[PDB]
Amino acid sequence: QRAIEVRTIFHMIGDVSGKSVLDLACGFGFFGREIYRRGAAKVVGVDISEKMIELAREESRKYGDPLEFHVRDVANMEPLGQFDLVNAAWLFNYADSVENLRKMFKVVRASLKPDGKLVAYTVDPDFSLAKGNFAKYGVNVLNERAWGPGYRHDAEFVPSQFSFYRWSRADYESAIADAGFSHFEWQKPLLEADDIATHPPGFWDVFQNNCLQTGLVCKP
Numbered sequence: 001q002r003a004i005e006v007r008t009i010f011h012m013i014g015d016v017s018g019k020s021v022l023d024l025a026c027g028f029g030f031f032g033r034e035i036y037r038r039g040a041a042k043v044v045g046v047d048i049s050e051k052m053i054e055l056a057r058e059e060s061r062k063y064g065d066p067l068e069f070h071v072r073d074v075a076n077m078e079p080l081g082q083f084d085l086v087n088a089a090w091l092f093n094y095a096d097s098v099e100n101l102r103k104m105f106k107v108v109r110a111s112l113k114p115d116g117k118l119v120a121y122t123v124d125p126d127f128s129l130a131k132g133n134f135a136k137y138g139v140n141v142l143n144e145r146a147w148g149p150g151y152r153h154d155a156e157f158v159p160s161q162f163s164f165y166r167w168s169r170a171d172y173e174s175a176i177a178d179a180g181f182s183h184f185e186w187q188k189p190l191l192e193a194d195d196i197a198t199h200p201p202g203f204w205d206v207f208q209n210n211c212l213q214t215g216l217v218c219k220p
């Protein structure tokens with residue numbers, strides 16, 4: 001069910017050959033490991049969860065890849081160096097305040113070579129629970145509650161549960177600018193004609209009219 005998401009992130013990333021890559025909020029390492037498979041020179045993954053990093057390391061042992069993992073809170077992260085690429089699939093929606101969203105963007109900037117780039121996948125600020133739930137596409141959004149200047153959502157995968165935050169487009173763009181990224185662009189998920197042809201008609205209507213997801217590319 002992650003086909004669109006994978007396609008969009010690797011579209012944003014482009015050619016990884018010979019690059020150094022920091023995969024933030026890496027989970028068991030899905031994106032970092034695939035980025036290595038596609039030719040990256042070196043991949044480091046970071047996650048706040050000790051359990052997730054324990055699985056990430058077990059996965060790297062099982063296929064013998066050279067990924068290195070760290071247990072760190074990205075918002076409050078010990079410096080790890082500078083990379084050609086920072087990948088952040090489902091990092092920023094875990095920032096629990098606008099202040100912590102802004103700190104995460106500053107950490108990413110400090111982690112980038114001058115010619116590097118951030119590729120991110122996060123919650124679309126324009127998502128509105130009343131316009132259509134996302135359960136049909138893999139994420140059952142259970143509720144939507146005002147949380148300071150943003151919104152908090154409880155959700156679950158179709159049944160592992162989790163909670164995340166939907167900050168406004170203006171707050172994301174201020175965090176980006178104030179962290180020192182001189183260029184950014186929002187990327188619509190890459191729903192393609194083949195996806196439409198292989199699903200019942202109108203299956204993707206809510207995905208198009210009320211997408212939970214968005215891509216984001218930022219450059220110093």
Ligand SMILES: Nc1ncnc2c1ncn2[C@@H]1O[C@H](CSCC[C@H](N)C(=O)O)[C@@H](O)[C@H]1O
Binds near residue numbers: 024
């Ligand atoms: N402050 C923080 N710093 C680092 N990781 C965090 C974090 N808050 C949440 N996470 C991690 O973010 C992950 C979101 S799930 C995304 C996992 C992976 N990038 C993938 O797409 O497959 C979880 O594994 C969670 O432990």
